[PDB]
């Protein structure tokens, strides 16, 4: 993985309607000065933000290891099926954005 970017698992999350859908974004913070973003990714190829690690049906909750994050959609719907991704925005010592590969929801 070039540039050490965050990950986004599972690649294909399948959930029935009604129950929750939880992706998990993994970002090991070398910098300790970072902000996560959680995107939905329209077939128009447009990128809309849904929540963040520095914080609605969309939650970003930090897990104990500090490298893994949960990204939960409560009361999921059929019109929530799509492609998602997360991106890490480091501010210091190096200003950068590193974004995971897209994962699908059904």
């Amino acid at each position, epitope marked *: 993985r*070039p*540039w050490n*970017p965050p990950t986004f698992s599972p690649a294909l999350l399948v959930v029935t309607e009604g129950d929750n859908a939880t992706f998990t974004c993994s970002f090991s913070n070398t910098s300790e*000065s970072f*902000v996560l*973003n959680w*995107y939905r*990714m329209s077939p128009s*190829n*447009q*990128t809309d*933000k849904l929540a*963040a690690f520095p914080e609605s049906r969309f939650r970003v909750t930090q897990l104990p290891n500090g490298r893994d994050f949960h990204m939960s959609v409560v009361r999921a719907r059929r019109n929530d099926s799509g492609t998602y991704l997360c*991106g890490a*925005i480091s*501010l*210091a*010592p*190096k*200003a*950068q*954005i*590193k*974004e995971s590969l897209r994962a699908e929801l059904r």
Partner: antibody
Amino acid sequence: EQQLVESGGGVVQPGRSLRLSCAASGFSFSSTYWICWVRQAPGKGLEWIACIYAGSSGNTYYANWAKGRFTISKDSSSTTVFLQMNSLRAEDTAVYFCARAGGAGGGVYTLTRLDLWGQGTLVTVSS
Amino acid sequence: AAQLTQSPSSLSASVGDRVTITCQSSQSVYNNNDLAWYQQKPGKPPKLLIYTPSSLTSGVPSRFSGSGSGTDFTLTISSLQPEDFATYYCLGGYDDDSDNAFGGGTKVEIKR
């Protein structure tokens, strides 16, 4: 549509200061964007000056030659970025662009990825 | 304290040629590819052609290509079209964004 408009250029006298403004429109100062300043002396090449992080933390990034003589900041009530240019000298006579880096969906972003540019404003340091 | 050296200073080429501009950094750029190539035309703001770390959706023509790692980078134009005669600048970033700087520029002119 996305746009950056520089303003505040013109004549300035050697030793005096000048503040430039970059009026952004069509987008918000989200968590994914940096506003930068690049200048170009007549006939010479591009020279990176400084960037400021749009969003809460407002981190500043300066070029070594510009540290101590330039100050970048943003307006809190609007979507504007300023460049305070102190102790100006003839070598500073240049066109000053403001550019933008960052976004979402392009994989990796650094301050070397300036994909939105204004038309630049001319500053003439002379008495 | 990085310096980016662009070779050659200028080159004269004909439409349809294959040109190669190079950019060499005194110190390695961040993660060995934090370098971007920009195109500028007289009176005009610059435009980002290649970002070495990621492929672009801007609509940059495919004939433009970036290559290289560490300190030596190359911009290649497979089939030079009339709309390409301009000046090309490389921009390198480092571990400290204070070291970021542009190259000297390569002015690509028409051969007649």
